[PDB]
Each structure stands twice: as C-alpha cells, then as structure tokens.
Design a protein around this motif. Sequence first.
Motif, PDB file in Angstrom:
ATOM      1  N   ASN A 164     -24.868  44.593   9.301  1.00 47.42           N
ATOM      2  CA  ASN A 164     -23.948  43.690  10.232  1.00 47.42           C
ATOM      3  C   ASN A 164     -23.311  42.328   9.286  1.00 47.42           C
ATOM      4  O   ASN A 164     -23.147  41.524  10.164  1.00 47.42           O
ATOM      5  CB  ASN A 164     -24.442  43.256  11.378  1.00 47.42           C
ATOM      6  CG  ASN A 164     -23.457  43.013  12.645  1.00 47.42           C
ATOM      7  OD1 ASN A 164     -22.422  43.510  12.560  1.00 47.42           O
ATOM      8  ND2 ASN A 164     -24.079  42.371  13.569  1.00 47.42           N
ATOM      9  N   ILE A 167     -20.424  40.160  10.472  1.00 47.21           N
ATOM     10  CA  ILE A 167     -20.917  39.187  11.383  1.00 47.21           C
ATOM     11  C   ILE A 167     -21.636  38.243  11.135  1.00 47.21           C
ATOM     12  O   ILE A 167     -21.573  36.967  11.330  1.00 47.21           O
ATOM     13  CB  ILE A 167     -21.420  39.862  12.801  1.00 47.21           C
ATOM     14  CG1 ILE A 167     -20.365  40.810  13.317  1.00 47.21           C
ATOM     15  CG2 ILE A 167     -21.825  38.953  13.918  1.00 47.21           C
ATOM     16  CD1 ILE A 167     -19.039  39.907  14.161  1.00 47.21           C
ATOM     17  N   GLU A 168     -22.976  38.643  10.447  1.00 49.43           N
ATOM     18  CA  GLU A 168     -24.032  37.645  10.001  1.00 49.43           C
ATOM     19  C   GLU A 168     -23.523  36.981   8.879  1.00 49.43           C
ATOM     20  O   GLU A 168     -24.368  35.934   8.407  1.00 49.43           O
ATOM     21  CB  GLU A 168     -25.183  38.469   9.914  1.00 49.43           C
ATOM     22  CG  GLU A 168     -25.612  39.007  11.338  1.00 49.43           C
ATOM     23  CD  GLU A 168     -26.112  38.207  12.318  1.00 49.43           C
ATOM     24  OE1 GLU A 168     -26.467  36.919  12.005  1.00 49.43           O
ATOM     25  OE2 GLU A 168     -25.971  38.737  13.393  1.00 49.43           O
ATOM     26  N   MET A 184     -22.246  32.127  17.602  1.00 44.04           N
ATOM     27  CA  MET A 184     -22.356  33.325  16.758  1.00 44.04           C
ATOM     28  C   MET A 184     -22.983  34.360  17.721  1.00 44.04           C
ATOM     29  O   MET A 184     -22.627  35.803  17.529  1.00 44.04           O
ATOM     30  CB  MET A 184     -23.785  33.052  15.856  1.00 44.04           C
ATOM     31  CG  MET A 184     -23.385  32.299  14.574  1.00 44.04           C
ATOM     32  SD  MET A 184     -22.417  33.155  13.485  1.00 44.04           S
ATOM     33  CE  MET A 184     -23.755  34.385  13.016  1.00 44.04           C
ATOM     34  N   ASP A 185     -23.702  34.163  18.984  1.00 38.53           N
ATOM     35  CA  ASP A 185     -23.986  35.083  19.960  1.00 38.53           C
ATOM     36  C   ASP A 185     -22.652  35.553  20.576  1.00 38.53           C
ATOM     37  O   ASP A 185     -22.611  36.814  21.003  1.00 38.53           O
ATOM     38  CB  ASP A 185     -24.990  34.533  20.849  1.00 38.53           C
ATOM     39  CG  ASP A 185     -26.481  34.384  20.426  1.00 38.53           C
ATOM     40  OD1 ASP A 185     -26.706  35.264  19.496  1.00 38.53           O
ATOM     41  OD2 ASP A 185     -27.265  33.760  20.796  1.00 38.53           O
ATOM     42  N   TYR A 187     -19.731  36.238  19.344  1.00 39.94           N
ATOM     43  CA  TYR A 187     -19.079  36.957  18.311  1.00 39.94           C
ATOM     44  C   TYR A 187     -20.076  38.228  18.086  1.00 39.94           C
ATOM     45  O   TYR A 187     -19.353  39.050  17.748  1.00 39.94           O
ATOM     46  CB  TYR A 187     -18.729  36.207  17.024  1.00 39.94           C
ATOM     47  CG  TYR A 187     -17.646  35.059  16.994  1.00 39.94           C
ATOM     48  CD1 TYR A 187     -16.317  35.790  17.191  1.00 39.94           C
ATOM     49  CD2 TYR A 187     -17.792  33.915  16.781  1.00 39.94           C
ATOM     50  CE1 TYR A 187     -15.329  35.045  17.361  1.00 39.94           C
ATOM     51  CE2 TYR A 187     -16.504  33.195  16.899  1.00 39.94           C
ATOM     52  CZ  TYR A 187     -15.444  33.548  16.903  1.00 39.94           C
ATOM     53  OH  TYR A 187     -14.367  32.639  17.107  1.00 39.94           O
ATOM     54  N   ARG A 188     -21.361  37.973  18.201  1.00 39.93           N
ATOM     55  CA  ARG A 188     -22.095  39.107  17.959  1.00 39.93           C
ATOM     56  C   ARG A 188     -22.008  40.244  19.287  1.00 39.93           C
ATOM     57  O   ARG A 188     -22.311  41.583  18.959  1.00 39.93           O
ATOM     58  CB  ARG A 188     -23.549  38.881  17.998  1.00 39.93           C
ATOM     59  CG  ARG A 188     -23.936  38.103  16.714  1.00 39.93           C
ATOM     60  CD  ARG A 188     -25.313  37.375  17.013  1.00 39.93           C
ATOM     61  NE  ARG A 188     -25.788  36.836  15.620  1.00 39.93           N
ATOM     62  CZ  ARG A 188     -26.554  35.627  15.535  1.00 39.93           C
ATOM     63  NH1 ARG A 188     -26.950  35.016  16.742  1.00 39.93           N
ATOM     64  NH2 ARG A 188     -27.039  35.227  14.504  1.00 39.93           N
ATOM     65  N   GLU A 189     -21.499  39.633  20.274  1.00 39.49           N
ATOM     66  CA  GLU A 189     -21.873  40.509  21.578  1.00 39.49           C
ATOM     67  C   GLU A 189     -21.249  41.880  21.724  1.00 39.49           C
ATOM     68  O   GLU A 189     -21.596  43.013  22.012  1.00 39.49           O
ATOM     69  CB  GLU A 189     -21.056  40.013  22.887  1.00 39.49           C
ATOM     70  CG  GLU A 189     -21.553  38.764  23.253  1.00 39.49           C
ATOM     71  CD  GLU A 189     -21.015  37.788  24.378  1.00 39.49           C
ATOM     72  OE1 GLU A 189     -19.989  38.589  25.162  1.00 39.49           O
ATOM     73  OE2 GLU A 189     -21.447  36.831  24.707  1.00 39.49           O
ATOM     74  N   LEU A 192     -23.431  44.817  19.034  1.00 40.85           N
ATOM     75  CA  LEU A 192     -25.010  44.927  19.140  1.00 40.85           C
ATOM     76  C   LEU A 192     -25.289  46.153  18.540  1.00 40.85           C
ATOM     77  O   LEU A 192     -26.647  46.572  17.784  1.00 40.85           O
ATOM     78  CB  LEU A 192     -25.528  44.495  20.837  1.00 40.85           C
ATOM     79  CG  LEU A 192     -24.995  43.316  21.037  1.00 40.85           C
ATOM     80  CD1 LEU A 192     -25.858  43.167  22.408  1.00 40.85           C
ATOM     81  CD2 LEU A 192     -25.569  42.175  20.077  1.00 40.85           C
ATOM     82  N   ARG A 197     -19.646  49.338  14.974  1.00 39.84           N
ATOM     83  CA  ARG A 197     -19.206  48.452  13.819  1.00 39.84           C
ATOM     84  C   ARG A 197     -18.248  49.018  13.192  1.00 39.84           C
ATOM     85  O   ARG A 197     -17.752  48.346  12.092  1.00 39.84           O
ATOM     86  CB  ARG A 197     -20.455  47.974  13.002  1.00 39.84           C
ATOM     87  CG  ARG A 197     -21.194  47.296  14.056  1.00 39.84           C
ATOM     88  CD  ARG A 197     -22.614  46.891  13.252  1.00 39.84           C
ATOM     89  NE  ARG A 197     -23.585  46.327  13.964  1.00 39.84           N
ATOM     90  CZ  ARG A 197     -24.808  45.911  13.685  1.00 39.84           C
ATOM     91  NH1 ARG A 197     -25.514  46.303  12.791  1.00 39.84           N
ATOM     92  NH2 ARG A 197     -25.685  45.497  14.943  1.00 39.84           N
TER      93      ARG A 197
END
Length: 296
Positions: A164, A167-168, A184-185, A187-189, A192, A197
């Motif tokens: 990931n 994103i990270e 960040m959370d 954008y991560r949603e 997961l 991806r």
Amino acid sequence: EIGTGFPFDPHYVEVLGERMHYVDVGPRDGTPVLFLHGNPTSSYVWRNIIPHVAPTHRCIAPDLIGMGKSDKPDLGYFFDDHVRFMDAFIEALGLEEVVLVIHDWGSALGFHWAKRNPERVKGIAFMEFICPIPTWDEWPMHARETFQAFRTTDVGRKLIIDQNVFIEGTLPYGVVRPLTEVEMDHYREPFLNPVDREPLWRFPNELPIAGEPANIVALVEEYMDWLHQSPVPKLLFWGTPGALIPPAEAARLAKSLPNCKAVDIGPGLNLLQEDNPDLIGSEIARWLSTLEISGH
Ligand SMILES: [Cl-]
C-alpha cells in the motif's frame, strides 16, 4: 486551521450499472463546477476548497470508479475505463455546460472531455496536471527511482498492492505540511483490502513517461495541443517545488496558454489542495465571478 471533516451529505448515482459517490452542493441556478480528483485521493481532496465556491456556484465532486466510496467493478482501471465511467457520470447528472476544476488523473479526464466537448466547457481551473514527460531526467532521483519501480509488474505490485505504498508513502510525501492520522485514515478507507488497490497501481503505469504507454502519450499530446489553441478561460495553480509542474513550467504555461491566469500557492508538491486550500478556493470563487456564465 486545515479542516479534516467532510461536511457534505452523501450522494450516489448509478453509472453503467455501478454506483458512483459524489458531492453535490450549491444552487442549480447556473453553470456547475465539476471537481475531478486523481491518484490516490477522492472527493475528500476538495473538502476545504468547495466551501469557498458552493455559496454562489454548484459544486459536483465525484469519486472516480474504484476510488473513494464509488463501487469497485472488476476492471483493469486503465485510463479508458475511467473515461467511460466519468463520461457516463456527467450524463447521469444531466450536465450540459460545466466549469472544470481538475488535478492529476482528474486533469487527464477533464482535458480529454473538454477536447471532445469544447462548446460545453466554460472554464478550466487546473493544477499538478498530466502532460507528457519525455525523459525520466525531469524528475529528482528519489521520485524517478520509486515510479520506475512502480512501473514494473513484480516489484511495482508488491509495493502498491501488497504494501500500500501509494497511500502510506506517495500520498503523505506529496504534501509539504504534515498530513495527520485523521486525514490518512480518510484516504486509507477505500483501500483497506489489497484486492481493491488495482487503480493505485494501474495509474502510475498509465503515466505518459518517455513515450510509454504510447496511447496515453498521444491522447495527452492531443488535449495539450487543444488547450494551447483554445480561448477557454484558464486558471493554473502551482507551488514550489511542485511535482508534475515545476515553477519554470508554470511560468511557461502562464504565457503560452490563451486566456490564462496563474496563481502561486506557496510551498507544494503534487497535492496542492492539502497545502493551501484557502487560496485555491478563494481564487476559484473570484475567477468564477469573472466568467460569462449565469450570475456574472
Ligand atoms: Cl499516478
């Protein structure tokens, strides 16, 4: 003083049988403003810009197919898949004429739509946009090395799909100010689950770099030649050092593009919206108040 909330009611529309999530706020009294995000963001990227514009202009901000809260069909998520879904999104809302506000892959979608439907575009605001990159030498070593790795099927998938890293890593690396854990959370949603991806990896593999992929290089040259001959009102935001658009290129475009105003947002990389949303929103609203559209 950069907001983390998403102060918009949810909307969803069926598009080619799949649901697409979108923001839609402000009055149906004129020309709506269509906001198109890129990789690896969503409509969340416009959250602090839209409130400057919505009081006087309708703002519509979709999540691209496979991104944000939009559905995740089993597609390759090539640029042409995004074209089909964004064309169908615009038709599903019954949009006639629009103003575009576009970024990164959203700028490829918007410029390509404008080239095909020029009478329906009343203005284009754009930033950190997709244009041809003829040489890897145009990027600093650290960015060159990472995107060359991304543009492999073994290493690139292990980084973007399994680890990931878009994103990270790529996301917070593209914001000059620190992104917070709450942001960040958000954008991560969507990502997961690693199987979700695919768009994050196909997008860098579509970037028109050193002649490949040739179909994207050709379509991007076509919409840049269109932009360079078009009288449409243009608003370019840029930052220092930028990423896709360094300051020297913004200065060139400020003179080469017809009917173009350029605005310096200050320090920025790719995700300019996360470094100076107040100026970007303020300047879009001021520029809209100069266009020959309903309310002028
Ligand atoms: Cl990308």
